[model samples]
Target: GSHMGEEDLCAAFNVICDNVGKDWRRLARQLKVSDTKIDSIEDRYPRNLTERVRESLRIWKNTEKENATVAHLVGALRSCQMNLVADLVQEVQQARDLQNRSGA
Candidate 1:
């Protein structure tokens, strides 16, 4: 178990997974995800916007350790005015936030 567990990360991750838009590039920029890598991710999913999200996140989690953070991913979207994205995060985030501080 790390600082934040997988289930919680999954909840936050799905918020992005549900989305397949050019906006993902902008969102990844906030996390400083690389365009070069995204180019590679593109080849991995030639159809594009299909499972590109899965690969984007795969790289996001694998290449940049701290970048996988739930807060950062969700925060980036919220800041991007991706309120639709943020809603899923907050709906799920609300419980995690509440539980996160209650382990005492």
Candidate 2:
């Protein structure tokens, strides 16, 4: 929330959580953060998060604007060792692709 507004940060975080299955344990493990940190951000929307974490979130949020589709996002997350999150994104992506193909 350093450079971005609180609402923007929260929205980005929500998108990540939605794509990542809302599993805090898995996310915390993958992100190398503690449960408390995750909880604080989710609940309190604190403004003192580390610069690196903020930057990471910013990049993740901006990836979509850079022409990153779900597949590309999954690949990027996997490259960062975020397997669980990647898996979740892949799942939703496949479902969406199928729906689109079927015109559902």
Candidate 3:
């Protein structure tokens, strides 16, 4: 429910990509990007930093492409979070009223 903006979604995706070595589908679900994106990254980059700029480009493109490709997923996650906030606010209001009635 904390997924509110692009940065947040990107961070979530990063975490997903960082851990998802075997579970491509779960990674895709979390990042909202395709498994092909991860595959492309592994195929092209392969973790060999021959040059600093190449390393930077690999990392940057990995992040930027993931972010750009899943823009729709970000929007969907944000909307879902808003709905969660509304539900949470209702729960908080109910809790406060219940506490007031109990004089606590």
Q: Over all chains combined, what TM-score does candidate 1 have?
A: 0.68
Tens digit per residue, CA lDDT, model 1, 1-104: 56747676665777676765765665665556777867877777777764777666666657556655666766677766787876677666566667565422
Per-residue accuracy of model 2 over 1-104 as CA lDDT, tens digit each: 25644432343344355544334334343445556656655554344333334433544445354444445545455654566666666554565566655421
Determine which window of 10 residues in candidate 3 has minimal summed lDDT.
48-57
Each prediction's whole-model lDDT (CA):
0.66, 0.47, 0.39
Per-residue error for 76 in candidate 3, Å, reads: 12
Name the lDDT value of residue 1 in candidate 2: 22
Candidate 3, residue 23: Cα displacement in angstroms equals: 4.8
- Better lDDT candidate (2, 3): 2
Q: For model 2, state the Cα shift of residue 53 in Å.
A: 5.5
Question: What is the C-alpha local distance difference test score of candidate 2?
Answer: 0.47
Write model 3 residue lDDT over 1-104, tens digit each, in one string.
55555453443344224333333333333434455655665566565323222323344336556553333333323443433332333333344456655421
Give candidate 3 misplaced runs (Cα > 4 Å). 1-7, 23-26, 29-39, 48-104
Question: Which 10 successive residues of model 1 have the least lDDT summed?
Answer: 95-104
Q: Cα-based RMSD of the predictions, in order?
A: 4.4, 9.4, 11.9
State which candidate, 1 or 3, has the greater lDDT.
Answer: 1
Q: Number of the top candidate by TM-score?
A: 1
